[PDB]
Design a protein around this ligand. Structure first.
Ligand SMILES: O=C(Nc1ccc(F)c(-c2ccn3c(N4CCOCC4)cnc3n2)c1)N1CCCC1
Lengths: 204, 229, 214, 206, 202, 218, 219, 229, 206
């Protein structure tokens, strides 16, 4: 698979007036591990963080194309792009390539700075948005992450609680995936503050 | 799909079944394969519903523009020739068995088969679709040209019914339309009033003796229809 | 025409110190439809102390089940009434699966039961009989969901907290009820009910438990 | 894959090795083709694939870097900059009619302060690049059949603080391990290093 | 899988990882990849875990039947041959199994690699499995004949560790054995994440 | 030569099985007068979707096995369950020989009170249920039959079970291409299995939305 | 997916399940498959979610732009023709299967658009994986000139057939009632699959997961 | 290939065309697809001539041995059942659409279609071969059971003629054979005396107006048949 | 093909070299596996393929030759005889269920007079054998990627009358030319020779 080549999984999770987005750290070529210090998270602004899974080339190209679009937006619009608009922009960008797609699966966490209402959006490689109340994931450990997140996740979780279940999900799911792990960088976004945490996991 | 168009004196009868099938499931039970091009020129559409609908809409639009700009009626030959060009141009891309038929006051009733190659043949009658292959022998045997308008309609309905009774890919309603000097008469025969079906034909009431009770004799009696007997 | 068909469903087992809870959902799905919500073919008693759970293709699970039932019956006769240990049945299952490795049973088996010392155990298998004794196991459509969750909640390897006491029969049952409820929600081929079997020294105590019917 | 390239980065140099082997099917055309192209005074790329793409890629980068200096009145671009220029060029190519450049690069460099005002990275830089356009900063990295042998050896023996001398010894163990273990005869390695002073060609290690 | 053995003056070290991986999903992190054929013979399993487990178990049966019939322990040569004869018989039946037979017989320590194609190679040093390419880099650089048993296990354990760190298909518990004149002893059984914090303390 | 869909449902004190009386040969509706439901000994009936030839052979093999055993040894006739067990093993043996019985049987029977209903696939998948269907019956009829069992959880009367079968046959007629509007219903009750004389179902075709003017493309 | 439309006396009822799936896995339990096309036109989508989203958005936008040019409520035939022509152009590579319901001045208008850009304008339609199960309920229970309640109940019944008998369909019935005057989108009209077993809250107190580094940033 | 067998009261009529074709060239113009098994049990052979001849000779030989050893007439059911076993055993190896038909004093005239699967269906009439597809609609419309022996032969000949008029793969002579209590009556209608052909049917005399002279009018007149006009 | 075997025959010896390389995909398992199996006191076979066939073939020949001596009261079979025995064994195999033995042989021997009455060939014999069972007497011949290199070099430098010493020099040039030119690392060659006195293992040349 072209999507499983580089490895890496990403997951995002909605709490009360906060979200956690967490990527593993591995970069690979099939089974050979190139680096153990390649988190897949990108910070658009205070309120939006996204991960890209899939073919590392395209994670990097797509992430650049997005950085271009979000910075142009910031100059033209004279404001930070919102999670909804950012997600919509990213589906537009992925669907521009329907026939010859980007091998990326973006996971977007966002938070409205005023309302405190959390927006997650995973996307497939051709832009199909998936916008659930609870959690989204992508990458090589996605089958195993869905299981962990379904089990551990509750609705109205505080940031600290949410981080723990996201970390335990990402770590436990990555322990059953050859192509993801070497711990995780998680990022706990609130209205007030953005915590970033490197999480100790296996070396495997 | 079963489509046919026969000529009577004044004009033509187009007739179709009403079933589109994704192979072995009936997606639509009440399709209208008789597709208007002008007031008095219809086509019957067999093959890819997508392809024939697209062509019929393209050709209908060209004929409408043409009719406005010449400021006269369109000839059936014109409709057939446009349809042939499109069916030929795209013969590798589309699956489209078309029958253009209609009335113009110059040539009266005309029928053109435009089959899958993009040949255009002007005929007294045309058959088309999966179900066509059933009717060639039906027409050879029972079709007599120089029918009344009424007889052609009754015959076209009896034909379509004979085809859809055997073709699995054909079924449902029999739609006809008569195109002549008069206002077009569409009519829709529902399957429960079809002129023929095998289910009601007394020929096929007695069941094949396939089952047959365990007997002390090679004499075939009937099917075993009760465990007690 | 493929001789193989995946009939979906998940099995899971968890061993404690005196017992195994063995569980398997009851939906038997065909091609793009579902055949039954009440298929009990997934779990099969070999001996009072030893059960086999079996996923993938039903028809092969049903053959393999009978093939083992008759190897186990022969063992009773040849070994003067003595029923084979869980360990013996686990090696037998490895051996029987491998003997078919040139037209393999499309069946992801577990053998689950008490060992020599009364302690529970689960042998999970691949297609061709590679196994190991473990204290839990999962096979089937939702195995990839349930196995990480069981790793997390039993082994706790990424937790600084002190390990909870032991996990009783009722806590272990509850953990599986929860794990299946999750799998049923997210796996499209797991659902309907879970048959739980609670193998103990005393005897097998079995209770059904409802999942999302969709 | 036939031609192994090895690089690692220490406090005050990046060391790059690359197998001389040019081959045609099973025939060694030469054991001494230099795969390490100097891009600027303080930048080079151990590029490994067939000669055709390897040259057409490295020359295109080298010429566009020289062009960018001509137009930027002799301003020497950073290593992050040319690494990203190189990956964008490789990545552009995988969605082109031409097809990918089938070349795997280790792009090594020493960033010096380019003026009084330069607040940027000082020191050695090393970037692993796949043919696809995967760019990753690494302390060491390898392409080729020998890659995994040397990558493991370097995990074991590489420290960030080795002398230029401990680096030669280490590079010789890496090269020797490719010779011992890969069936493709990589009998001669070109070894270069980038220091504050620039590219130097190491002849001791081969 | 990563799995290495080597002969040295103290006898044979055999070291293995513990992970069974179907490329992507980790089936198990606790697979025993050293089969203990008799008291003086060790197999290693790599490739198809079933194929190796089955045919090493057969080998173990032929080795035991040999000991019953002939009233003497089988040689490593003969045991490696028995397995090489199986894998050669099944050479175009798509077996997947890279194996090492390591033992101490009348003729001192012997180590043989045995492939799925019936290859049977007798050398002083091997590594087998997806992570061999990694193990070999560490193993070849640190390998001498004159190693102490301590230093030979260290080398082996580090060599497996460095494969587990880099190979996706390799990981879990780094088990090390020592084959000597008195048989084999299981030296150590260490988790490879604990080994990371031992070997790289910072 | 292929059988279309079979549908079956348990009612209070028996099982109804229904099938079109049509063998198709591809698209072609070759024979609309084929008795597709077959009685197996005294208690059981069977009907198959798929190769009539494989059904004809299997049904023959089974029906012999039943009569032979009963006649040779002075034993009680095989139960529905046992006849079905034999049919299942037979079909699975054929898929293990890569000579499959390329048809999905539905199997009904009643010994005493004991009311048996089960399905078996080409590959030896088998399932008992309160309603079974094969072919397009599985995709079309099952949803409706299952709904009728969910609504009447105590159990269906023969009348309610016949009303729902008839409504499923109507839909199969509308939506299965290779169907005719001529059916037979096997009814396994205590006395044994009866097969109905063939019947048709009333069909509605005169919805205002099926008129020529609405359904027109142009 | 199972999406359903019936014409009733006063308008159209559309119906959809809610389960989105990545392969064999439910990505979103409560995703919305009934898309706004115009004030008087809705459009349930099956097939490739990306394509259904893109084609339905593209058209709704064109209809909106065209509504400013005409000053005239969008006709369901205009919507239908824009989807057909788009889908046809792409030879089914844009794999959007659609159920377009609306009520213009010509009256209730319900149609399918197949991915290849075929249309069938019918009084009851189904699309998606659970189309056949749903259609069985519709063929069994549809009559002409149903009340709004009869029609909503029938559509929910049809969707439920997909929910329970198709694995790609699930969760709840979203229903939409387009009448001449207004468009009422009821989300979870029917929720047959509530909660079996209340979620066992596994408690992981803060500091459970070991953390190497931590950067806090205040705003 | 067109083969059919209908039942009248006393017995049966088998009928067949006479053309074996290697695709588009007629290898044999006068084949006899009506193949004797016993005195009064024939088969009609469609598909691989090799395969059906081989089966017909095998089954004829079994029936002859059987008839010798039971010391009585063979039932058509017996012939059909033997032919089914062989056509089923080898269903993957052979291409063989058979119709076993005949007389026996127990069951009178009997027809069995054994199509490609190795199904054996007992029928009032059976159709087989490439040309069968033309006749299903012909029989549905024109076939009335309870015909005389003479009417069945006339009808069977008219049938085969209607098939071989439209099927390229069928043609030549129409062979019939009546099997009843009386001595078998074979007869062979040559193509120049066939009861139907399109070439002689007045329906198809007037040519399609395909060619059409270059005119100053859209009025279709006729084909251009002279360079001077 | 990876593993090059070389042999040539002079007045009073046959010299045989074979590459030590045993390989697994691209990983040198060893550079020092002996491919040259002694079949009798004055007979040996540089056999080159994968280890599995090479051993199963050579051992089968060796055991049948030894069996044929046991039954023939210690009579040492001629080289023509074992060459033909070997080719018949290879040729039988290409029409067997098992498939061909994928092994290329150079079968070298010295025929000594086996009694007073022996009128047969005296002196060194060399037989090229393809995997298919092609047997050909040759003065010299080679299997492997290096075959055509060495075959040309021998066409140039081989005389029928070279000393044992001029042969060592020549065998070194041959081995060296494989290392120089084939990309597959054949870094160590086992060299053996058959003389009147028997097989001797040449260590000088490698
Ligand atoms: O490695 C082998 N020999 C050898 C022989 C036969 C074999 F089957 C396999 C082998 C085969 C699949 N292996 C895996 N797979 C890969 C693909 O991803 C899933 C996990 C993991 N490990 C593996 N090792 C190894 N040797 C290296 C040099 C000496 C011999």
């Amino acid at each position: 698979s072209i999507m499983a080549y580089s490895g890496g999984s990403v997951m995002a999770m909605a709490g009360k007036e906060c979200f956690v987005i967490i990527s593993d750290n591995r970069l690979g070529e099939q089974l050979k591990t190139i680096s153990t210090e390649v988190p897949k998270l990108h910070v658009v602004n205070d309120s939006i963080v996204y991960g890209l899974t899939g073919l590392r080339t395209d994670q990097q190209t797509f992430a650049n194309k997005v950085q271009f679009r979000t910075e142009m937006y910031k100059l033209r619009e004279e404001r930070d792009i919102t999670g909804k608009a950012f997600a919509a922009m990213i589906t537009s960008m992925l669907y521009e390539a329907r026939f010859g797609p980007w091998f990326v699966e973006p996971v977007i966490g966002s938070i409205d700075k005023s309302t405190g209402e959390v927006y997650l959006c995973a996307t497939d490689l051709i832009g199909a948005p998936c916008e659930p109340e609870d959690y989204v994931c992508a990458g090589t450990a996605a089958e195993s992450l869905h299981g962990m997140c379904e089990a551990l996740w509750r609705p109205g979780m505080s940031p600290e609680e949410l981080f723990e279940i996201a970390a335990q999900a990402m770590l436990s799911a990555c322990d059953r995936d050859s192509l993801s792990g070497y711990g995780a960088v998680a990022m706990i976004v609130t209205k007030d503050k953005v915590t970033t945490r490197l999480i100790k996991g296996r070396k495997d | 799909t079963t489509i046919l168009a026969v000529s009577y004196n004044g004009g033509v009868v187009l007739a179709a079944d009403s079933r589109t099938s994704s192979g072995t499931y009936v997606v639509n039970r009440a399709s209208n394969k008789l597709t208007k091009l002008t007031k008095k020129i219809y086509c019957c559409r067999s093959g890819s519903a997508a392809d024939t609908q697209a062509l019929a809409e393209r050709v209908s639009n060209y004929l409408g523009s043409y009719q406005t700009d010449i400021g006269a009626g369109v000839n059936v030959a014109t409709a057939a020739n446009l349809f042939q060009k499109m069916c030929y141009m795209n013969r590798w891309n589309i699956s489209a068995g078309i029958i253009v038929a209609g009335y113009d006051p110059i040539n009266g009733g005309s029928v053109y088969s435009i089959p899958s190659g993009g040949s255009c043949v002007k005929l007294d009658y045309a058959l088309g679709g999966s179900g066509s292959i059933f009717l060639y022998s039906f027409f050879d045997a029972n079709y007599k040209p120089g029918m009344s308008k009424s007889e052609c309609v009754a015959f076209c309905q009896r034909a379509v019914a004979h085809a859809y009774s055997r073709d699995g890919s054909s079924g449902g309603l029999i739609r006809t339309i008569t195109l002549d000097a008069d206002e077009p008469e569409d009519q829709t025969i529902p399957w429960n009033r079809s002129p023929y079906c095998m289910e009601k034909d007394p020929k096929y009431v007695t069941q094949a003796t396939q089952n047959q009770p365990f007997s002390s004799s090679a004499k075939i009696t009937g099917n075993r229809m009760s465990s007690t007997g | 025409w493929s001789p193989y068909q995946d009939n979906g469903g998940t099995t899971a087992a968890i061993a404690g110190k005196d017992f195994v809870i063995l569980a398997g959902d009851t939906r038997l799905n065909g091609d793009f439809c579902l055949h039954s919500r009440h298929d009990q073919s997934k779990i099969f008693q070999l001996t009072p102390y030893t059960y086999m759970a079996s996923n993938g293709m039903q028809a092969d699970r049903l053959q393999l089940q009978q093939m083992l039932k008759y190897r186990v019956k022969w063992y009773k006769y040849n070994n003067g009434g003595k029923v084979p240990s869980t360990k013996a049945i686990a090696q037998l299952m490895s051996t029987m699966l491998y003997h078919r490795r040139f037209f393999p049973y499309y069946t992801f088996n577990m053998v689950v039961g008490l060992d020599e010392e009364g302690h529970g155990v689960c042998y999970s298998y691949d297609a061709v009989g590679s196994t190991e004794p473990f204290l839990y196991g999962t096979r089937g459509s939702a195995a990839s969901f349930v196995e990480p969750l069981l790793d997390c909640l039993i082994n706790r390897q990424h937790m600084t907290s002190q390990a909870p006491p032991e996990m009783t029969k009722e806590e272990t049952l509850a953990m599986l009820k929860n794990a299946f409820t999750g799998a049923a929600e997210r796996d499209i081929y797991t659902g309907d009910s879970v048959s739980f079997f609670i193998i103990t020294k005393d005897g097998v105590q079995q209770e059904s438990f409802e999942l999302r019917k969709d | 894959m036939a031609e192994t390239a090895i690089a690692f980065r220490c406090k005050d140099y990046v060391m790059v090795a690359a197998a001389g082997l040019n081959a045609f099917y099973y025939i060694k055309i030469t054991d001494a083709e230099d795969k390490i192209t100097q891009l600027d005074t303080h930048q080079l790329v151990a590029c490994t694939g067939e000669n055709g793409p390897r040259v057409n890629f490295t020359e295109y980068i080298k010429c566009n870097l020289a062009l960018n200096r001509m137009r930027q009145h002799g301003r020497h671009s950073s290593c992050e900059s040319t690494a990203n220029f190189m990956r964008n060029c490789l990545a552009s190519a995988i969605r082109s009619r031409e097809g990918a450049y089938q070349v795997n690069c280790l792009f090594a460099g020493y960033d010096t302060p380019v003026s009084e005002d330069d607040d940027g990275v000082v020191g050695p830089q090393l970037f692993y690049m796949d043919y696809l356009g995967t760019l990753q900063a690494v302390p060491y990295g390898c392409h080729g059949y020998g890659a995994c042998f040397v990558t493991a050896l370097l995990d074991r023996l590489w420290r960030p603080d080795l002398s230029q001398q401990e680096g030669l010894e280490l590079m010789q163990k890496c090269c020797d391990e490719v010779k011992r273990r890969v069936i493709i005869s990589n009998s001669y390695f070109f070894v270069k290093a980038v220091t504050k002073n620039g590219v130097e060609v190491i002849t001791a290690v081969h | 899988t990563t799995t290495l053995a080597f002969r040295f003056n103290g006898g044979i070290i055999v070291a293995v990882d513990s992970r069974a991986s179907t490329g992507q999903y980790i089936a198990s992190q606790t697979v025993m990849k050293v089969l203990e054929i008799n008291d003086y013979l060790l197999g290693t399993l790599a490739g198809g875990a079933a194929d190796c487990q089955y045919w090493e178990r057969v080998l173990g049966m032929e080795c035991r039947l040999w000991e019953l019939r002939n009233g003497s322990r089988i040689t490593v040569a003969a045991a490696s041959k028995i397995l090489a004869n199986i894998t050669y018989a099944y050479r175009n039946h798509g077996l997947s199994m890279g194996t090492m037979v390591a033992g101490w017989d009348q003729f001192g320590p012997s180590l043989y690699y045995v492939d799925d194609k019936g290859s049977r190679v007798k050398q002083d040093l091997f590594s087998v499995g997806s992570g061999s390419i990694y193990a070999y880099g560490v193993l070849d650089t640190g390998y001498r004949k004159d190693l102490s048993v301590e230093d030979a296990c260290d080398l082996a354990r580090r060599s497996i560790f460095h494969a587990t760190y880099r190979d996706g298909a390799s990981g879990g518990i780094v088990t090390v054995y020592h084959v000597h004149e008195k048989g084999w002893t299981k030296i150590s059984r260490d988790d490879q994440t604990k080994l990371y914090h031992r070997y790289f303390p910072s | 030569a292929s059988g279309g869909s079979v549908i079956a449902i348990k009612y209070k004190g028996g099982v109804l099985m229904a099938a079109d009386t049509l063998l198709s040969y591809g698209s072609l509706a070759k024979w609309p007068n084929i008795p597709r439901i077959r009685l197996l000994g005294s208690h059981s009936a069977v009907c198959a979707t798929g190769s009539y030839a494989d059904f004809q052979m299997m049904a023959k093999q089974v029906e012999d096995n039943i009569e032979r055993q009963k006649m040779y040894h002075n034993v009680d006739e095989l139960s529905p369950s046992e006849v079905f067990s034999y049919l299942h093993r037979s079909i699975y043996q054929k898929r293990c020989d890569f000579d499959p019985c390329l048809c999905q049987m539905v199997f009904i029977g009643v010994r005493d009170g004991e009311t048996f209903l089960a399905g078996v696939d080409d590959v030896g998948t088998r399932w008992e249920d309160d309603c079974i269907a094969t072919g397009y019956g599985a995709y079309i009829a099952l949803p409706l039959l299952r709904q009728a069992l969910e609504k009447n959880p105590d159990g269906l009367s023969r009348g309610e079970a016949m009303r729902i079968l008839t409504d499923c046959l109507r839909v199969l007629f509308y939506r299965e291409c290779r169907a005719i509007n001529k059916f037979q219903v096997a009814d396994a009750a205590s006395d044994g299995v009866r097969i109905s004389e063939p019947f048709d179902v009333e069909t509605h075709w005169e919805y205002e939305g099926y008129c020529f003017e609405k359904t027109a493309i142009i | 997916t199972t999406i359903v439309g019936v014409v009733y006396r006063d308008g159209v009822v559309l119906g959809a399940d809610t389960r989105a799936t990545e392969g064999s896995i439910v990505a979103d339990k409560r995703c919305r498959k009934i898309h706004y096309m115009a004030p008087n036109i809705m459009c349930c989508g099956a097939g490739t979610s990306a394509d259904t989203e893109a084609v339905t958005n593209m058209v709704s936008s064109h209809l909106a732009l065209h509504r400013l040019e005409t000053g005239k409520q969008s006709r369901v035939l205009e919507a239908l023709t824009l989807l057909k022509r788009h889908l046809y152009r792409y030879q089914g590579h844009v794999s959007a299967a659609l159920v377009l319901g609306g009520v213009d001045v010509e009256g209730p208008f319900l149609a399918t658009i197949a991915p290849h850009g075929s249309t069938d304008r019918l009084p009851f339609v189904t699309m998606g994986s659970g189309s056949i199960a749903a259609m069985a309920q519709l063929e069994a229970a549809y009559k002409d000139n149903m009340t709004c309640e009869e029609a909503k109940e029938l559509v929910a019944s049809a969707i439920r057939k997909g929910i329970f008998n198709d694995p790609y369909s699930g969760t709840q019935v979203d229903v939409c009632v387009i009448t001449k005057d207004k468009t009422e989108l009821t989300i979870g009209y029917d929720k047959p699959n509530e909660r079996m077993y209340p979620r066992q809250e596994v408690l992981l107190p803060p500091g459970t997961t070991p953390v190497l580094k931590e950067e806090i940033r205040q705003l």
